[PDB]
Paper text:
Mutations in the human [name] gene cause the neurodevelopmental [name] syndrome. Based on the crystal structures of [name] from Drosophila melanogaster (dmPURA), three conserved sequence regions termed [name] repeats I, II, and III were identified to fold into globular domains. Whereas [name] repeat I and II assemble into an N-terminal [name] domain via intramolecular interactions, two C-terminal [name] repeats III from different molecules interact with each other and thus mediate dimerization of [name].
In contrast, the spectrum for hsPURA I–II [name] indicated a strongly altered secondary structure content. The asymmetric unit of the crystal contained two molecules of hsPURA I–II [name] and showed good overall fold similarity to the hsPURA I–II structure. However, an overlay of both molecules of the [name]-variant protein from the asymmetric unit also revealed unusual differences between them with r.m.s.d. of 1.48 Å for 125 superimposed Cα atoms. More C-terminally, the loop linking β6 and β7 is shorter by two residues, thereby correcting again the sequence register within the next β-strands (β7 and β8). From all the areas of the structure, the β-ridge appears to be structurally the most divergent part. It is surprising that the [name] point mutation, which is located on the β4 strand of the β-ridge, induces the observed unusual change in the β-sheet arrangement without destroying the domain’s overall scaffold. Importantly, all the resonances perturbed upon [name] mutation remained in the presence of 1H-saturation, confirming that the structural rearrangement does not induce protein unfolding. While hsPURA I–II quantitatively bound a 24-mer CGG-repeat RNA, the hsPURA I–II [name]-variant protein showed moderately but significantly decreased RNA binding.
Numbering used by the authors:
A (entry chain B): 55 to 133, 145 to 176, 179 to 210
B (entry chain A): 58 to 125, 141 to 212
Amino acid sequence: GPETQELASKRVDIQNKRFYLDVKQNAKGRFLKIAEVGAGGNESRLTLSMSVAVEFRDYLGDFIEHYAQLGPSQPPDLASEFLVRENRKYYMDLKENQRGRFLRIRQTVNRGLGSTQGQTIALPAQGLIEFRDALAKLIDDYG
Amino acid sequence: TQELASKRVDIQNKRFYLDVKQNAKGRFLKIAEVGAGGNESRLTLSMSVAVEFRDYLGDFIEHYAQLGRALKSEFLVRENRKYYMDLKENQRGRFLRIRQTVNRGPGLGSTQGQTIALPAQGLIEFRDALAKLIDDYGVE
Ligand SMILES: [Mg+2]
């Protein structure tokens, strides 16, 4: 609320989706919040450390360079996986929905049968370069 | 396949060659660790993964530099490949181990694959060399 202050923000418009890339700050340090605004104003959030954001900028870079090769392999005629794990706990997954022309990104934490849920955005493939450019500009300026 | 550029980083008895190479598919980074009798271990990365690898090294360096949430292990599954990066400690020294395995098809599992082990003292030098070849020869 008044705990976290906002330092900077960028808006990117791709199809009917609006993304806000925010640089924010609290007691715990500086982080990057991505807000996606869908139909009916349904927001989904992705929240990144400044080091995971650097990584994420480059994962987007990888897909931009390699979008078809990293897409889902065609099925068998009648005759892909992109996952990052850190300290065996924190997961980030990126996967193309070919029907949507979307890149789905999920961040989760696993803790045996411990409980936890996580965070998911989907980026139209036609706004990948623009999203990534905006993300990169915020990293250049906000350490 | 053409050798565009190389750099050598010397860390204890080991030497690490970082080479940019070019072929059909695109540019890659060959890393090759040479021990005291010339035994080689080799790692080949696309430039995209080389860039990811640069970022992982910054994180290992933040952990190594800490006095007394910091990256201890990183795993990346990308296409038919897995990469395992483990900041290991023994009493003889701290080092970063990097294992590559590759999936050789359905039902075949994956190859044990070649391993490099980077003494922690040389992470910064190694990262600096990598970053310089990415700047001079990378795309992303
Ligand atoms: Mg993560």
